[PDB]
Symmetry: D2
Subunit: 288 residues, 4 copies
């Protein structure tokens, strides 16, 4: 099992010098660094090539996460937004190929975070979404990318909140390059059973995000890690496990994640490094 | 220990025929019926004695919960809003005295749900709210009412997300009729420890809400009920326990609570009644 | 879905008692089953058996039997005479169960209990002899309409079968339809890496289930992962019954064999014991099904 | 918080070349090695200093565990047995002071493992033990050693099975050098609450043994480690935490601990080293803070 961490653990915006973090997590011992997709459309082929060679240099595999904007909403009733959305993913997926990135994940069937003042049309958005995603999936297959649909709690998305819903959606899309993606922070709120949710995901599970109930690094909270290790083994899980902890207030990140107190408790970068590393040793130990 | 249930488990709006529910709930065996404060301001004085008479007749104690509107926001920087807020609560509290209810709870130091598209000024809102709630406390005291401030998850409020924050706020208010309030659904997201959160609240805990991780009735979910029961015993809790399950889509209730799937799985009124009653026997049994 | 019972010994300190009294009590508390100790059964005259049967039937109660065998009834003994005496004991007992209209017996039927550890242990050898003996006793049980359940116990009470995997291995070797694995939350709590895992491991072989908290209090207020147990029973499609086996009182052969060295009941009188068992029944039906 | 491990994790008898293990565990990263008291009386005065030399050298602190024989039973109704028991502990404890060991633990108030074949007189054994222990306590306060009374499950002892009984006995002894000692293996069986038991022990908690429900090294089993760490923080535990894993069949250890299946799953000494090391990282991570 490959273990990684989301660069955002150290940053407050959906961009950063990914080369800096590639070097950092290589030395902390991770196998993967997960980066936000939004700055990638602004990269020249020269920039793409050196990010790839840097990852290759430090032996880090790169995975991508993305919280779509309203403009990239594949489920939109607006046909122009859906058209712009597909063009965005078509370009993005092609860049992922140039980067030898074989996985992208997040609320890709919608946008994040949802603006709840709009009016929800779950039934309508769901049907439009399944159609849009199946299309994008052809481009994903061509670029060799696993398009992972993350199940989110109710406050962040209304389309897919439980693993069963995720499996329903993915089965309805019916394209091998579309997988279900689970996240322990999200399962903690919505699921009746954690091992149960993983087992329900089964062969469709393409990616796993980890964090404690309140998003601290994995291990000293209430998430049932041993139960998760068991269920992953039950489904013969063959994917990466990326920790996505958020412990700092401020910026677009603190605001979108809703960190309203200093959960890191004054950690400086070295302290943050120490804990991610301890949480990595924990995860390899307990989850495999 | 007194056990209750929030009338909203059967309804999709913040008001209903409370007399009907007093009768149902007395028949299911509950000690308490919790009702939404929303309609109480507009109750003729006859309606108040009728509701009050019904409760006494059926041996049911009434408690009140309230998600305040933006105009009732005691933390608002706008002085006219704070003035209205205070007028709202003084009138509501006098009515509660007439209705013979001694407890009100919710995000009373703020408003609910939070419109996150407005800028967040936590420190400023915090200082204002503490000062505002302290004034209201005087009236709550005159009316024989415990003013309980509920600790909520990050997605529903930004001022108080943990038992420690709630205690810091209440001690700062420094008035005997202002209490901390916890909710198992909210604790499940924010806390490092459930039992620890309860022990942190300690003497300040004046009310407790229950529900599974995903708001189903207590019992077959992942909430650590025994640990909650053991911590209530540790602190010597002398209050009540009200389950607040939300399993139905639709209306203001379904959208404020964000129920996007039929969690009840088709239950009709009779089936909701039985599940409520089974969770009551579980609750009395496990929480002691 | 499942039938729920309680072992009569929750109220008694010897491995026998007036079972009719307990059938009447548990029927009123709402149980489907009363599990009784086998020990006094070889001394029941035919009419005593019929009265016990009529009492259970008249009260809509189903009887199951538990048995901690004596060293003289050790089917795994290296002594050929003890094994012979053992088989005769079981044959006679199974026929009595047939007269009683009882279809399930469980416990350390492949050994004896409590095990005297001052004796040298020969696991490999005892295992082989046991498997052999069980096979032939199983044939008698089959003819009597009785499922022979082998209970997986913790290390301090037996050395042959301490985990669900060992229980499944042993039961597969026996290779007889009416011979089954039986799990008990108190024993799994000690030996198993995973509770749900153990149950899923037992799978289609699981024929009986005993319940009790970690220190043997009635189910519900302790640390046993009940919810997890319910999911795993649903995963394996468990059809059988679930019998809580609380032991909260000091004294007698029961207190001594179960090693209750403090008053875990906290001074409960009979009526108090009755109330807890009933709440624990309500809890078990609510949490364990679906 | 110092972390250790019991040497018997690698051995099948209650003795071994403790130097080999001090060097092993120092390399593995442990702060402490716990050794069995059994072979200690047979040590000559020279043998003591060597062992103590080998320990300070490697920067390892030594704690001692001891499951008493019937003849060292401080709770015995036989005055001659109680007499020899105090003699045994007085001698053993003087040796411990010459080793600069400051803590000993186990069913020191009785014997282990007990023969349940005999007649048990809990009330009587309890009263004799309380007095005997309080006496031995004087000698312990003298050799600068903490006399730790470990709470055991019903199958291994009948005098003290819960933290509450442990605290009651210790408070009865009423002596600064006698502490309560908990063990996750035993608490897992007897306690209503793990964190509750630790909080009950409170300031009386003098030592802690860890292990999974079935005695594997800490980490991948069902023990509530986080709850344990939060509870140690609640009581401000300063003490040592010693893992006591037992995964091997055979010998007196295999028989006393009752390992009747190869729980190690064919691990060799190198494999056992790795798991203990990983469990150590887990324990320092989860248990602290
Ligand atoms: O868990 C998440 C949001 O709460 C998802 O992984 C988002 O796609 C990610 O955080 C966006 O950066
Ligand atoms: O838990 C709650 C909202 O999440 C609070 O109790 C609210 O005040 C209540 O649900 C509003 O009706
Ligand atoms: O769990 C058990 C003993 O520990 C078994 O069920 C015994 O056979 C039973 O209690 C004996 O009556
Ligand atoms: O846990 C123990 C016995 O189960 C105690 O620590 C014993 O004293 C120790 O194992 C003796 O070697
Ligand atoms: Mn995520
Ligand atoms: Mn609430
Ligand atoms: Mn049993
Ligand atoms: Mn120990």
């Amino acid at each position: 099992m490959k273990h990684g961490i989301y660069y955002a653990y150290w940053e407050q915006e959906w961009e950063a010098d990914y080369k800096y973090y590639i070097e950092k997590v290589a030395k902390l011992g991770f196998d993967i660094l997960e980066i936000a997709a939004s700055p990638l459309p602004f990269y020249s082929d020269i920039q793409i090539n050196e990010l790839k060679a840097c990852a290759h240099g430090n032996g880090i595999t790169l995975t991508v996460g993305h919280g779509p904007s309203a403009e990239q909403n594949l489920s939109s009733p607006d046909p122009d937004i859906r058209k712009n959305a597909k063009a965005f993913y078509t370009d993005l997926l092609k860049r992922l190929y140039k980067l030898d990135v074989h996985l992208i994940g997040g609320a890709l069937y919608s946008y994040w975070p949802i603006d709840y003042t709009k009016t929800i049309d779950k039934k309508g958005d769901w049907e439009r979404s399944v159609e849009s995603v199946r299309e994008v999936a052809k481009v994903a297959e061509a670029c060799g990318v696993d398009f992972c649909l993350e199940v989110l709690n109710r406050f962040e998305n209304y389309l897919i909140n439980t693993a069963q819903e995720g499996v329903d959606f993915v089965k309805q899309v019916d394209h091998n390059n579309v997988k279900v993606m689970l996240d322990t922070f999200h399962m903690n709120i919505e699921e009746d059973s954690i091992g149960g949710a993983i087992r329900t995901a089964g062969s469709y599970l393409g990616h796993l995000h980890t964090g404690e109930c309140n998003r601290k690094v994995p291990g000293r909270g209430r998430i049932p890690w041993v139960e998760i290790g068991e269920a992953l083994a039950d489904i013969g899980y063959n994917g990466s496990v990326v920790m996505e902890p958020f412990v700092r207030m401020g910026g677009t990140v603190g605001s979108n994640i809703k960190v309203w107190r200093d959960i890191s408790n004054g950690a400086d970068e070295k302290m943050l490094d120490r804990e991610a590393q301890a949480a990595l040793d924990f995860s390899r130990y307990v989850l495999e």
